Design a protein around this ligand. Structure first.
Ligand SMILES: Nc1ncnc2c1ncn2[C@@H]1O[C@H](COP(=O)(O)OP(=O)(O)O)[C@@H](O)[C@H]1O
Ligand code: BEF
Ligand SMILES: [Mg+2]
Ligand SMILES: [Zn+2]
Ligand SMILES: [Zn+2]
Lengths: 104, 585, 670
């Protein structure tokens, strides 16, 4: 039941070499389904909560999904959807403010 | 109950305790696994799939499991049984085991609640009695119609929240499963929890065939809960039928009743739930109002008073006929209400949308612009006189003339529109009717449009650099030209005035009229799309001289628009907007 | 009561493994935005996890392969998607971090990982390949995958098995890229205005005050294929968590808290361009929204400065994540483009509250808004109880029409006002809040693949096990087929049976997705088919030809001699379905007449889409004549299978293309 992290510990050895030498071998038993912890410490001091980490992960996703749609594909129907959604949300928030301005 | 009795599954992990959470059935997982409904809604259903009894999995569900939720191939189970985790942290094994077994003990304690045993004895007994189509079996199928399932959901989701309050989330999920409607937004399931809901079933569709089994099984399963009931003409058939079925599929020694009055079902204890009948005129919790279109006063007072209670759900299941479909007592309620009454109709709003709900009809018994867009349109109007910076500097005016008098289709339509942000806004409307036998119909029409424009100009001074005017010439080219000429001259008393011009076929002349033909379908198509998405609105200070002595101009326009499938104003509005090839000076 | 069935422990192990894989794919979606100088530090952990996923989807690869071919389940589908996407992203992130340290460029690494230069990998083709023509669409969004799956369930009675499996593989290959993240659902593929299959099922069921259901599917945000997850984030977040950080020396932690305490000591300008009606001078709602947004900007900038300072104190390096390495492209966006995306120190709920604390202030209408239940209650109570002159006249009429408009907005239309305000608030919340994912796509994918793989598995499983007496190869089967046809074309339909044909017809024209007739709260096949037919928008001139397709010596002998389930002549999607309906009605009426003339046995006219597997690999196909929807071997009659039920050594079956040949071979064998 020896774990994979205390099995191989050395220099780069590009991933396919490790796959060939350690786990693709048929003589192995394939125990040790223990994953590892990949999130760093410099990313926990500033986002110290799964909620805050998820919010940041969503903010950067919403930004990337704007930078890619801003060689001449020029239609990229996802881009037209993302422009229609923004131009709809703008009008909707403006009318939501204006209506309650009028209700007084 | 099988998935509740599972051992620890040691299952070591690397995430710090400051993040990990305890999902039931499984060990301790990172907090992200509680935010993703992809895994949460699976680890939550494979567990509640054990509380659901074996008589509520379906007709064909598998041997001894809900095979469409818990099925592992005979090769994947043998390849999974050889998977082994880190299995431990000796200083950290005991707390995780304690937490997991504590959550599972909470679940098991939920399994043993008497009030939950009653809800099970209700839903299981109902799905079992329904197998025989509610015959007199002591205890080809009896499929429920749609509303005959909505009534059951309305009763069960209420009595669940009333009898079992300390288990809101768990019983909510259990009922979502048992009705075979999982992945339902909690807004709908919450709507099921409301009281005082109204039904409207057509006769001979089945309302008493389903009520008396509902009444009988809401009596015999639950304990100590009364059940109201009221009708105008003295309920005797339903009462005798309830007596019959209860004495049939339960011990007749248990039922005790006096004719036309309280029926009571016995129990080992002194629970003795009752069906006291209020037809002949405390805590009821159902108050099944069986007829709600024929009530006499001094009998509505008990119903208005029971609304003051917090445990009664007055169900207004009342029949309709379609000869009196617009009941003087309920069909008006659909005006000012929100998720209160649900009609059971097969010929919907229009004269013949029946082909839509045709397949929905019982087998035994054998609008271009959306309303929301119209309500939003009239409901919200932007103030143009104070948001002039949002407007484009061009006005577009379309005149759709009719050159007759003393006719209902003799109205001239005029619209003055512009761009507002990237949307379109109406500044003025006219529905103008020639005085009979005037000598100057074009000038009368011109004076009407000029007066409208002027008012719009005065309300927004300095806003507009251009006004572009189209006079439809389909009716008469000469008469359209005459209108343009009078508009031209009168406006000569700043913004530049430009007319749309047309070079008629075979001609080299550019006339100041507009010919409506090939551009109609694109114009209408674009309008419908824009209007429906909230992109066309009316100015809060919209101008109209001709619609100022009987109805609101926007309300009037909307009545014409709702004929899309006298149209002068609709055409002018749609075409003015379409206009907003180059028109010129 | 001690031993629990081994499938239950295997399912618990699979749930734990799915949770671990989800955690790993969350760490991956984190390291795709972290500084490469830190990705190089976490390189060994990422390599170890990639090795783990590789060695993991080889112990489950034959298992999941056998599973896909036998009754897929939401757990298995979700696990396959997560394992495949985790493998993909692990290999890609490792490659992109090892490409770094050769270029040493951060902006390049971010344009690579976050996919800023990729050529839109969210396009796919299907090529449904039905009979009578092969219709091909293009999956782009998520609701498009949902629509295609519903379309396949609808036209399930024409498409063959292998074509359906090919289309379903090319759909799962797109779901791996879209539903693979399972946590953030990038906005390039989401259109909440499109209601999914469950919005219709929960709009048929909830209240409908008139308002034909086709008129309600236009306002719904559908809230199911992309949920909201309601993330909440405190104000002084890191200061709460810095004293108890992991692996920090007490001296460093103390001086870091000191630097934090010391350092603690949007596009608002573009609001005036918005259409703001009402009074211009004074306390208005647009100025209140501007002040709320300015306060939120102050909070976020303060948090960012504090974070930079504490990182300079603890590690000494101002880390460059995807919001600090692309701050040039950021901080230049408009008001709306900063509202949609933004707030790494706030939450979308904080933006919602900053807007609503500005709208709802100091006011009838708010009472209806806060509690609509009491509003409908009072409604029910009330129901039960019951040039110069031009300018001056313009000012006067605009005055008397603003007054009337405000009078309407305060007195009447309150139903419409409440509904519109609620819908606007919903359209705001669905746009701002973090969409995570939904549980509709794997559910429907499993529900459709189950039916199709079940048809294929029955076609392959009844191959042998006994006599396979075939009637598609015709020695003289004409002689015994025309006789039975003439013997059944003689009697009347006996309309006292139509309430059974009209049900056993919709029980076959239906699809495997919408059960709604085996729920144990079963609804008739009428509604069970109305769901699967109205969801996939059908022409109303076809919806009546479903209901009225049995009300009427022909019309139940429309098949030729050998070509019963054969659409060689016709082409299209509507006429192919019409011929399918003709053939199915013919089979049903033939079975009913055969029962009403001959008393040999029962047929019960079953379908292979039923017979879900038991605890392990057992199917027990009961006796009867099946439909099988296969143009190569449509009719399969199991005259007698076994004492247990499964197709065993004594399970003689009869293949045939010819319905009456089956009805004669059943009689001969029974
Ligand atoms: N889906 C159904 N399930 C069971 N019975 C049904 C169904 N549809 C119609 N029926 C039949 O309709 C009748 C019910 O009529 P009933 O509810 O008494 O009419 P009313 O609404 O006028 O009181 C019964 O004969 C019942 O068998
Ligand atoms: F359909 Be009835 F109440 F005669
Ligand atoms: Mg009757
Ligand atoms: Zn694209
Ligand atoms: Zn939806």
């Amino acid at each position: 039941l020896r774990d994979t992290i205390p099995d191989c510990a050395l220099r780069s050895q590009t991933l396919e070499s490790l796959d060939a030498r350690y786990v693709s071998r048929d003589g192995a038993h394939d125990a040790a389904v223990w994953f590892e912890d990949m999130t760093p410490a410099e990313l926990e001091v500033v986002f110290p909560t799964t909620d805050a980490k998820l919010n940041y992960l969503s903010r950067t996703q919403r930004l990337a999904s704007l930078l890619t749609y801003a060689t001449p594909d020029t239609a990229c129907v996802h881009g037209e959807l993302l422009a229609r959604k923004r131009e709809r949300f703008a009008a909707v928030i403006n009318r939501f403010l204006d209506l309650h301005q009028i209700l007084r | 109950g099988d998935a509740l009795r599972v051992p620890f599954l040691d299952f070591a992990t690397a995430t710090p305790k400051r993040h990990q959470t305890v999902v039931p059935g499984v060990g301790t997982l990172h907090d992200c696994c509680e935010h993703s409904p992809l895994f949460s809604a699976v680890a939550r259903r494979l567990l509640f799939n054990s509380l659901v009894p074996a008589q509520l999995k379906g007709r064909d569900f598998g041997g001894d499991h809900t095979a469409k939720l818990e099925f592992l191939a005979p090769e994947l189970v043998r390849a999974v049984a050889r998977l082994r985790f880190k299995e431990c942290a000796p200083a950290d094994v005991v707390p995780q085991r304690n937490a997991y077994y504590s959550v599972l003990n909470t679940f098991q304690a939920l399994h043993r609640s008497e009030a939950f045993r009653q809800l099970v004895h209700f839903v299981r007994d109902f799905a079992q009695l329904l197998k025989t189509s509610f015959r007199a079996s002591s205890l080809t199928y009896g499929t429920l119609e749609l509303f005959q399932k909505m009534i059951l959901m309305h009763a069960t989701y209420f009595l669940a929240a009333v009898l079992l309050g300390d288990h809101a989330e768990q019983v909510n999920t259990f009922l979502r499963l048992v009705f075979e409607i999982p992945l339902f937004s909690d807004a709908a399931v919450r709507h099921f929890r409301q009281r005082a809901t109204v039904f409207l079933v057509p006769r001979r569709h089945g309302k008493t065939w389903f009520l008396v089994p509902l009444i009988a099984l809401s009596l015999a399963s639950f304990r100590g809960i009364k059940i109201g009931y009221t009708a105008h003409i003295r309920t005797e058939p339903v009462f005798e039928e309830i007596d019959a079925c209860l004495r049939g599929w339960f011990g007749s020694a248990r039922v005790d009743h006096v004719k036309g009055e309280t029926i009571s079902f016995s129990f080992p204890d002194g629970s003795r739930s009752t069906i006291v009948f209020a037809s002949s005129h405390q805590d009821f919790n159902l108050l099944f109002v069986d007829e709600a279109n024929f009530i006499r006063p001094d009998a509505v007072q008990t119903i208005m008073g029971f609304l003051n209670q917090a445990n009664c759900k007055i169900i207004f299941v009342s029949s309709t006929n379609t000869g009196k479909a617009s009941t003087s007592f309920l069909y008006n309620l659909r005006g000012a209400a929100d998720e209160l009454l649900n009609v059971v109709t097969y010929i919907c709003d229009d004269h013949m949308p029946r082909v839509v709900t045709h397949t929905n009809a019982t087998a035994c018994s054998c609008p271009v612009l959306t309303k929301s867009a119209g309500e939003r349109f009239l409901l919200y109007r932007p103030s143009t006189t104070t948001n002039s910076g949002l407007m484009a500097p061009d006005l577009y005016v379309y005149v759709d003339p009719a050159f007759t008098a003393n006719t209902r289709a003799s109205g001239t339509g005029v619209a003055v529109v512009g761009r507002y942000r990237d949307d379109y806004i109406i500044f003025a409307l006219e529905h103008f009717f020639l005085r009979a036998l005037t000598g100057s119909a074009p000038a009368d029409i011109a004076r009407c449009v000029v007066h409208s424009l002027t008012q719009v100009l005065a309300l927004h001074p300095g806003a507009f650099r251009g006004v572009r005017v189209a006079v439809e010439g389909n009716s008469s080219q000469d008469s359209a030209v005459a209108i343009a000429t009078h508009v031209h001259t009168e406006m000569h008393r700043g913004p530049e005035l430009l007319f749309y011009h047309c070079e008629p076929p075979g001609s080299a002349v550019l006339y100041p009229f507009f010919l409506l033909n090939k551009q109609k379908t694109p114009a209408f198509e674009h309008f419908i799309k824009k209007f429906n998405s909230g992109g066309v609105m009316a100015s809060q200070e919209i101008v109209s001289a001709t619609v100022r002595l009987q109805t609101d101009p926007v309300e009037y326009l909307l009545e014409q628009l709702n004929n899309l499938t006298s149209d002068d104003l609709m055409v002018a509005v749609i075409m003015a907007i379409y206009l907003a090839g180059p028109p010129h000076t | 009561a001690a031993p629990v069935s081994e499938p239950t422990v295997a399912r618990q192990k699979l749930l734990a493994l799915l949770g671990q894989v989800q955690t790993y794919v969350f760490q991956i979606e984190l390291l795709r935005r972290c500084d490469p100088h830190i990705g190089r530090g976490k390189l060994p952990q990422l390599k170890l996890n990639a090795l783990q996923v590789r060695a993991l989807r080889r112990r489950l690869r034959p298992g999941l392969e056998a599973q896909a071919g036998a009754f897929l389940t939401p757990l298995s589908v979700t696990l396959e998607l997560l394992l495949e996407y985790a493998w993909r992203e692990g290999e890609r992130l490792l490659g992109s971090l090892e490409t770094f340290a050769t270029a040493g460029d951060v902006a390049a690494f971010f344009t690579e990982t976050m996919g800023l230069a990729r050529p839109c990998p969210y396009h796919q083709r299907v090529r449904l390949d039905t009979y009578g023509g092969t219709v091909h669409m293009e999956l782009c969004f998520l609701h498009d995958v949902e629509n295609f799956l519903k379309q396949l369930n609808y036209c399930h009675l024409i498409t063959p098995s292998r074509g359906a499996t090919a289309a379903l593989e090319r759909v799962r290959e797109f779901m791996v890229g879209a539903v693979g993240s399972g946590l953030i659902v990038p906005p390039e593929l989401s259109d909440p205005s499109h209601p999914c299959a469950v919005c219709f099922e929960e709009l048929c069921v909830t209240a409908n005050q008139g308002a034909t259901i086709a008129s309600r599917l236009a306002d719904r945000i559908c809230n199911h294929v992309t949920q909201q997850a309601q993330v909440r984030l405190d104000a002084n977040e890191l200061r709460r968590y810095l004293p108890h950080a992991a692996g920090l020396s007490d001296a460093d932690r103390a001086r870091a808290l000191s630097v934090l305490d010391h350092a603690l000591a949007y596009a608002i300008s573009e609001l005036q361009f918005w259409l703001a009606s009402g009074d211009r001078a004074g306390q208005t709602t647009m100025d209140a929204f501007a002040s709320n947004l300015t306060a939120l900007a102050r909070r976020e900038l303060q948090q960012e400065t504090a974070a930079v300072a504490v990182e300079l104190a603890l590690f000494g390096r101002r880390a460059e994540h995807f919001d600090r390495a692309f701050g040039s492209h950021l901080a230049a966006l408009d008001m709306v483009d900063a509202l949609i995306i933004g707030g790494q120190a706030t939450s979308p709920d904080d933006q919602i509250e900053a807007l609503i604390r500005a709208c709802y202030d100091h006011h009838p209408l708010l009472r209806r808004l806060v509690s609509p239940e009491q509003c409908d209650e009072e409604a029910l109570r009330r129901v039960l109880a019951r040039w110069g002159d031009i300018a001056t006249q313009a000012a006067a009429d605009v005055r008397e029409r603003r007054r009337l408009y405000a009078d309407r907005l305060t007195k009447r239309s309150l139903a419409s006002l409440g509904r519109c305000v609620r819908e606007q608030r919903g359209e705001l919340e669905k746009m701002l809040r973090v969409s995570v994912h939904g549980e509709v796509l794997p559910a429907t994918f499993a529900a459709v693949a189950n039916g199709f793989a079940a048809r294929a598995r029955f076609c392959a499983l009844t191959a042998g096990a006994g006599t396979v007496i075939d009637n598609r190869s015709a020695p003289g089967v004409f002689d015994a087929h025309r006789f039975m046809r003439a013997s059944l074309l003689r009697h009347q339909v006996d309309p006292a049976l139509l309430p059974s044909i009209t049900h056993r017809f919709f029980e076959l024209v239906n699809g495997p997705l919408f059960d709604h007739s085996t729920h144990s709260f079963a609804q008739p096949p009428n509604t069970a088919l109305y769901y699967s037919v109205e969801n996939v928008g059908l022409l109303p001139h076809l919806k009546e030809e479903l209901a009225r397709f049995i009300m009427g010596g022909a019309d139940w002998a429309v098949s030729e001699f050998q070509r019963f389930y054969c659409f060689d002549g016709i082409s299209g999607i509507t006429p192919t379905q019409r011929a399918a309906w003709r053939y199915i009605r013919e089979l049903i009426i033939a079975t009913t007449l055969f029962a009403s003339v001959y008393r040999c046995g029962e047929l019960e006219l079953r379908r292979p889409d039923c017979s879900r597997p038991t605890s392990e690999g057992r199917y027990r196909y009961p006796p009867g004549v099946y439909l099988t929807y296969d143009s190569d071997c449509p009719l399969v009659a199991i005259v007698e299978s076994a004492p247990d039920g499964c197709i065993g050594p004594r399970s003689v079956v009869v293949y045939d293309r010819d319905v009456f040949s089956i009805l004669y071979s059943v009689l001969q064998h029974l």
